[PDB]
Design a protein around this ligand. Structure first.
Ligand SMILES: [Cl-]
Ligand SMILES: [Cl-]
Length: 317
């Protein structure tokens, strides 16, 4: 069912006016209201779903709580970042059509996802690329964690490049994001009956596989599996993804013996040292424990030193 009449003007709850464009979930190009049509280079998108859609409500709440343009900018200034890969929230509202109620949200428009680019590079990213991606993902994770949320589903298809700057990567898709710490009260080590989702099976955390709610260590664990996938094209459990108990068993055993994971994934060869160190540091975290993000970033910075490079913000894609 069509949710918009192309080129109509929609007004958000803050009375800001936007125009709807072509598709690019149900996502359309959007821009500020003007005499012009919305073009292919539009700086925004409008996400629209029925008002009873759970994920868009969850996502909207995340964006309203943590992604206000001046909230992000303040954090950038105070932590001295070049940028922060949390997309900006521009507004939202309610839209009725054909007697059905819809929710809509306006957010930044992006370029390509990383999964497309990974597959065009024969399912490899270079070590330089992986370290630079991971540093920026750590900035993002620290931010969202400090604002009471975990993502639980970090992967290359949820990483998008700035439309005007291909060295800036953004983490998208908060429809299934979890408020692990509402009002500073950490959730208990247990399943949340309100949350069904377990992340993406090849990348998800051991906590998720055990059926408990995702926490901060889980996000960092997910990023660890992504790094291996990106560097090598593979994960050990990739042929058993229809069998969750196998995937969990494998992740548990490999966490208990990280050297065996390194031998498995970097076979007959030295493993890049930063990856084992990253994983050893994450392994030390308890469920409720606050990560030492700077130490994790130091581990990756040492990997850049090791290859004759530095954090110059260049993703080399
Ligand atoms: Cl804040
Ligand atoms: Cl291959």
């Amino acid at each position: 069912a069509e949710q918009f009449a192309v080129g109509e003007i929609i007004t958000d709850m803050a009375a800001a006016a936007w125009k709807v464009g072509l598709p690019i979930g149900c996502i359309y190009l959007a821009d500020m209201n003007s005499s012009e049509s919305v073009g292919s280079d539009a700086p925004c998108v409008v996400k629209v779903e029925p008002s009873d859609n759970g994920p868009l409500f969850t996502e909207l709440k995340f964006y309203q709580r943590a992604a206000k343009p001046e909230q992000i900018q303040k954090w950038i200034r105070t932590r001295k970042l070049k940028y922060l890969g949390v997309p900006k929230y521009w507004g939202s509202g309610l839209h009725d059509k054909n007697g059905k109620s819809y929710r809509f949200m306006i957010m930044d428009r992006f370029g390509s996802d990383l999964q497309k680019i990974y597959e065009a590079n024969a399912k490899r990213f270079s070590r330089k690329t992986v370290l630079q991606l991971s540093l920026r993902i750590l900035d993002i994770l620290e931010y969202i964690h400090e604002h009471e949320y975990v993502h639980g589903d970090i992967k290359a298809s949820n990483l998008l490049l700035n439309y005007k700057n291909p060295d800036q990567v953004y983490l998208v898709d908060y429809g299934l994001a979890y408020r692990y710490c509402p009002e500073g009260v950490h959730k208990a080590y247990a399943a949340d009956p309100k949350r069904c989702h377990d992340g993406t099976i090849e990348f998800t955390s051991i906590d998720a596989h055990n059926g408990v709610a995702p926490s901060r260590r889980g996000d960092l664990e997910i990023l660890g599996y992504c790094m291996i996938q990106w560097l090598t094209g593979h994960l050990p459990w990739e042929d058993n993804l229809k069998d969750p108990k196998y995937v969990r068993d494998s992740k548990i055993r490999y966490r208990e013996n990280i050297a065996s994971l390194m031998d498995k994934c970097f076979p007959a060869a030295n493993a890049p040292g930063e990856i084992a160190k990253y994983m050893e540091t994450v392994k030390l975290l308890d469920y409720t424990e606050k990560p030492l993000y700077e130490n994790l970033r130091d581990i990756l910075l040492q990997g850049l030193k090791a290859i004759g490079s530095k954090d110059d913000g260049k993703l080399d894609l």
